[PDB]
């Protein structure tokens, strides 16, 4: 996260770290959506241009964390993966369209003060909140700068959703309805973005109607990090919710 701040304890209790077993390293962010299901970006698991194609036994999830590198004894919980599900129309060849994946845990995780699921939006909450200018929150343990370094604890940044024409005009990549973009414009002064290692983490909004947190996006892609005139692009969770529900219902 570029130009963010240290998270408060328990501020993002749905935060998940995707952790490679060997070598032991951070792979991505993710989010807890129930006691058995974790949501992430497909490119965290499958990205052939970078020779990335993980199987379940390559990975662990670490839930309840705050420190990036510490083993947070009596606080974090580490879970093994039963199965990965990647969207069948995930487009890793062109533009990361449908950049979404689910991971089912081998065993349910116990909720605590530090471990708790985020809601997924329904159609009405998405329509109400996914509007240009409305701010969401991105969290992660990724890089603090595009070029460097890395944070001691989970980082947080609040960013406004951007008008679709501005998103389109900021890039040569073909944008789709399964993406939205967020970030400040050069003229707005404030800044901030996700960066490498924040992939797969959540873009959340707090509904002013029922005071619950909803995951509206998944950290997906950006040209650099926090560059003037660029924006971060996020998987549109509601647009892909029918797939989410089909997977969870079936498996």
């Amino acid at each position: 996260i570029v130009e963010g701040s240290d998270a408060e304890i328990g501020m993002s209790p749905w935060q998940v770290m995707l952790f490679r077993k060997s070598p032991q390293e951070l792979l991505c962010g993710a989010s807890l959506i129930s006691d058995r299901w974790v949501l992430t970006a497909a490119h965290c698991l499958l990205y052939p241009p970078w020779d990335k194609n993980f199987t379940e036994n390559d990975l662990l999830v670490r839930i309840g964390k705050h420190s990036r590198t510490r083993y947070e004894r009596n606080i974090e919980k580490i879970s093994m993966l039963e199965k990965i599900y990647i969207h069948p129309r995930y487009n890793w060849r062109e533009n990361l369209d449908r950049d979404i994946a689910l991971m089912k845990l081998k065993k349910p995780v116990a909720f605590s003060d530090y471990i708790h699921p985020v809601c997924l939006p329904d159609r009405e909450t998405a329509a109400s909140l996914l509007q240009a200018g409305y701010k969401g929150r991105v969290t992660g343990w990724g890089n603090l700068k595009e070029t460097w370094g890395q944070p001691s604890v989970l980082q947080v940044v609040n960013l406004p959703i951007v008008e679709r024409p501005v998103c389109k005009d900021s890039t040569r990549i073909r944008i789709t309805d399964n993406m939205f973009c967020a970030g400040y414009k050069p003229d707005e002064g404030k800044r901030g973005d996700a960066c490498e290692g924040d992939s797969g983490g959540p873009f959340v909004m707090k509904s002013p109607f029922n005071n619950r947190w909803y995951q509206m996006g998944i950290v997906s892609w950006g040209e650099g990090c926090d560059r003037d005139g660029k924006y971060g692009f996020y998987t549109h969770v509601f647009r892909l919710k029918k797939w989410i529900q089909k997977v969870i219902d079936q498996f």
Binding site: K21, Q24, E25, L26, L60, T69, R70, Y71, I78, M80
Partner: peptide, 11 residues
């Protein structure tokens, strides 16, 4: 860089 995690999670 990362603190070792209990071996039970790697088995």
């Amino acid at each position: 860089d990362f603190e070792e995690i209990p071996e039970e999670y790697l088995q």
